A = this chain, B = another copy of it.
Amino acid sequence: SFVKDFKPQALGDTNLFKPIKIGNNELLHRAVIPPLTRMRALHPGNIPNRDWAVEYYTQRAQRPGTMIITEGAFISPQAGGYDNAPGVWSEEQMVEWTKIFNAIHEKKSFVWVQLWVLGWAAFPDNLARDGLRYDSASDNVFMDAEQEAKAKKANNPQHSLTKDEIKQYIKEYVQAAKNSIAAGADGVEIHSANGYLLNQFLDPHSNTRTDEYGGSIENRARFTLEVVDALVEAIGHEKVGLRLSPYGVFNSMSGGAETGIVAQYAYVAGELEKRAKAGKRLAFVHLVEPRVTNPFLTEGEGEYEGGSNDFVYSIWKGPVIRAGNFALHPEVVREEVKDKRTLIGYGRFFISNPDLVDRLEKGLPLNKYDRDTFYQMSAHGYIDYPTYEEALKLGWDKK
């Protein structure tokens, strides 16, 4: 059905439909598809789903000029740990990502691969099966009880990375960014949000290191800015973006309770503008809003309103994509895009509305999403959500 009690509002008279250029791409509108894990990749191999992934992405690439950021893709085996999310390190994987990049491009939209490394959010048993370590910034703080039980049972203890092992993750990040560009992607987004490895080094609760990768604002951001610097040398700054969640608490990050958290992220945004001055301005900064602190909570659960992402605008002066509970609040978006360099990420509603960009333009109803197939190895709940027309021929009240 459509979202029952929502009152749509057309947004076509707003800057959400003005073109803007991001990197080398000329978006026709500013609604972007933020990275969404769906768990349909194939085990063994972390292969993009050979039966349904081109159609899913082809479908969401339908309104021309859309920026699409893929699911997070693992840069290498040690970076992974979930059997059914895709990676971007092997030939077999790059043969199905090429097919996907081309079909999006057939539709004249654009595609940015999110590079993902799990840290302590990985399942330590999977990793153990495969001979891999269970990594994190430190080893005396664990994500949670379940993860702790899981590592003891796999007998795969959490491991504090050595400098030489951080350096190998910087080697795999560069390779995986060269492989995505070589296969046809328009750019890569570095995932340094949502409690995954890079964010475990940025946060004071998960990073209790004493070396130059922890213990100060400057040392906690170091691994994230080496990765930005190696990928801007490897493939160019117009092909790189950075996702950050300042106030997120998913996967045991501190959020707003750490009184130091605005300084930690202000510092990253400042270094990123330092580089802009020296010529190397990244394509965009992507921010998860505090209005969603964990994406597995229903819209309106875990709004963190003792803090705001607006500080970033004072420091970074380039395009900002913002994501988090914007589809059921077009009144909030209308205000937000009055800013001229703000793009809006719509995540749960791009799952359920393949044609979200026309619905937003025209003010049409929105298809409800089914939270039970967000992760399922099915086509159902993946490629079978209907466009408005189809939902009308289906008679989703209105027939």
B-contacting residues of A (Cβ < 8 Å)? 216-218, 259-263, 266-267, 269-271, 273-274, 277, 306-308, 310-311, 314-315, 317
Cβ-defined partner of A308 (8 Å) among B269, B274, B314: B314
- The reply to whether B217 and A311 contact each other, CB–CB distance below 8 Å, is no
Decide if B217 touches A267 in the complex (CB within 8 Å).
yes
Q: How far does the alpha carbon of A306 sit from the alpha carbon of B273 in the complex, in Å?
A: 13
The answer on a CB contact under 8 Å between A263 and B217 is yes
A215 to chain B, nearest CB (A): 9
Residues in B with CB closer than 8 Å to A260 are 267, 270-271, 274
The answer to whether B259 and A274 touch across the interface, beta carbons within 8 angstroms, is: yes
Q: How many copies does the complex hold?
A: 2
A-B pairs, top 4 by smallest CB distance, nearest first, are A263-B266, A263-B267, A311-B311, A259-B270
The minimal Cβ–Cβ distance linking A172 to chain B, given in whole angstroms, is: 29
- Partner among B262, B271, B306 whose Cβ is within 8 Å of the Cβ of A266: B262
Residue of B nearest to A306 (CB): B314
Q: How far is the CA of A33 from the CA of B4 in the complex (A)?
A: 55
Chain A binding surface SS class: helix
- For A266, what are the chain B residues with a Cβ–Cβ distance below 8 Å? 262-263, 266, 311
**Contact between B259 and A311 (Cβ–Cβ < 8 Å)?**
no
Q: How distant is the Cα of A277 from the Cα of B260 in the complex, in angstroms? A: 13
Distance between A269 CB and nearest chain B CB, rounded to angstroms:
8
Considering the complex, give the chain B residue whose CB is closest to the CB of A216.
B218
- Say yes or no: A277 contacts B259, CB within 8 Å: yes
With CB as the reference atom, state the residue of chain B lying closest to A315.
Answer: B262
A273 to B: closest C-beta gap in Å: 4
A269 to B315, CA, bound (A): 17
Docked CA distance A61–B315 (Å): 40
Which residues of B have CB within 8 Å of A261? 270
A218, A262, A306, A310 pick with most chain B CB within 10 angstroms: A262
Contacts of A262 in B (CB 8 A): 266, 269-270, 311, 314-315
Q: Which of B218, B259, B273 contacts A259 (CB 8 A)?
A: B273
* Residue among A259, A260, A307 having the largest count of chain B Cβ atoms under 10 Å: A259
CA distance A54 to B259 in the complex (A): 42
Instruction: Enumerate chain B residues within 8 angstroms of A306, measured Cβ to Cβ.
Output: 314, 317
- Quick one: closest B residue to A274, CB to CB? B259
A311 to B261, CA, bound (A): 12
Give the residue name and chain of the B residue nearest to A310 (CB).
Answer: B310
Residue of B nearest to A275 (CB): B259
Q: Which residue of B lies closest to A267 (CB)?
A: B263
- Residue numbers in B under 8 Å from A308 (CB-CB): 310, 314
CB contacts (< 8 Å) of A274 on chain B: these are: 259-260
In the assembled complex, which residues on chain B have CB atoms less than 8 Å from the CB atom of A273? Answer: 259
Contact of A315 (CB < 8 Å), options: B217, B259, B270, B315: B259
Chain A to chain B contacts (Cβ below 8 Å), 10 pairs: A216-B216, A217-B217, A217-B263, A260-B270, A261-B270, A262-B311, A262-B314, A263-B263, A263-B270, A310-B311
Chain B residue contacts of A311, Cβ below 8 A: 262, 266, 310-311, 314
CA distance A218 to B259 in the complex (A): 14
Complex Cα–Cα for A217 and B266 (A)? 11
> B residues within 8 A CB of A270?
259-263
Instruction: Give every chain B residue within 8 A of A216 (Cβ-Cβ).
Output: 216-218
- C-alpha gap A311/B311 in the complex (Å): 6
Q: Output the residue of A263, A271, A306 with the most chain B CB within 10 A.
A: A263
Alpha-carbon distance between A262 and B314 when the two chains are bound, in angstroms: 8
The interface residues of chain B lying within 8 Å CB-to-CB of A307 are: 314
Report the minimal beta-carbon distance from A112 to chain B, rounded to whole angstroms.
Answer: 25
For A267, the chain B residues whose CB sits under 8 A away are 217, 260, 263
List, in ascending order, chain B residues with CB within 8 A of A263's CB: 217, 263, 266-267, 270, 315
